[PDB]
């Protein structure tokens, strides 16, 4: 009886400026694994299997990476 | 019986000026796992199978990483 | 009976400047891991199975990394 | 009958200016673990299996790292 | 008959200016581990299975490390 939730009930001169506002936001990830089988043999790599929640308002540079998830960087300068 | 939740119930001449926001943010994540299996062999490498949460406002700079999971860097300069 | 929760309820001449703000929040991460098995072998390598909030409002610099998880870093300068 | 909770239960001229704020905050993280089995072998590298919870107003340096979970540093300079 | 909680019920001319604020903060962490069993083979490297909060408002400095969980550092300078 495996169950995952994320809820939002609301059983029952105002001015706004710039405001009730969502910017960068992640809201309501629900995951169920139930009786699953992973085999992982890695060498040198990036595995990744999980849950990744990323928010961000703001990145800012030259050669920047902002989110990254499974990510192999092998540059040469 | 698993379970995983996140909930808000709310049961029942204002000035709002860049108030009541949301930047950068993580909100209600939930993860059920019953019963799983999992074998992991890592050379060298990265692995992630769990959960990852992240909220960042402001990330900056020339060359930077905000958010990272999962990640190999193997450069050269 | 295995559970994880996270709630908020809330049964029953204002003036907000740059007020009730979010920036850089993780909230909310409910996580439920029942009867699994994870057998690990790791060599030189980063693996991450758990649970990773991170919650930042500003990083700043030249080259740097916010927020890793699971993260190899082998550069030749 | 395990469970893990975190509630915020509210049963029932102001001015604001840059107050009721949030930056950088971690609130509500849940987690269960029941039953469970783990086998780790580490040779060398970092592994992670726990609950990690980072909350930063501010990190700043170059070649800073601010949140590091499960990380691997081998850098040739 | 586990259970591990954190709560804040509330049963029932001001000015605020940068007031009743929080940065850097890690509120509500509840954690229940009930017939676990962990077997940790550990080689020079690095492993965390238990419970890491960190608050930091500000971490300044060129090659600084804010928080760091289960970290290998093995540079070459």
Do not use: C, M, P, R
Not at 31 to 42: F, I, L, P, R, W
Not at 49 to 63: C, D, H, I, R, S
């Amino acid at each position: 009886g495996v169950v995952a939730a994320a809820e939002k009930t609301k059983q029952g001169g105002v001015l706004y400026v710039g405001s009730k506002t969502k910017e960068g936001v992640v809201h309501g990830v629900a995951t169920v694994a139930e009786k699953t089988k992973e085999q992982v043999t890695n060498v040198g790599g990036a595995v990744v299997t999980g849950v990744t929640a990323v928010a961000q308002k703001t990145v800012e540079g030259a050669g920047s990476i902002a989110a990254a998830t499974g990510f192999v960087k092998k540059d040469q300068l």
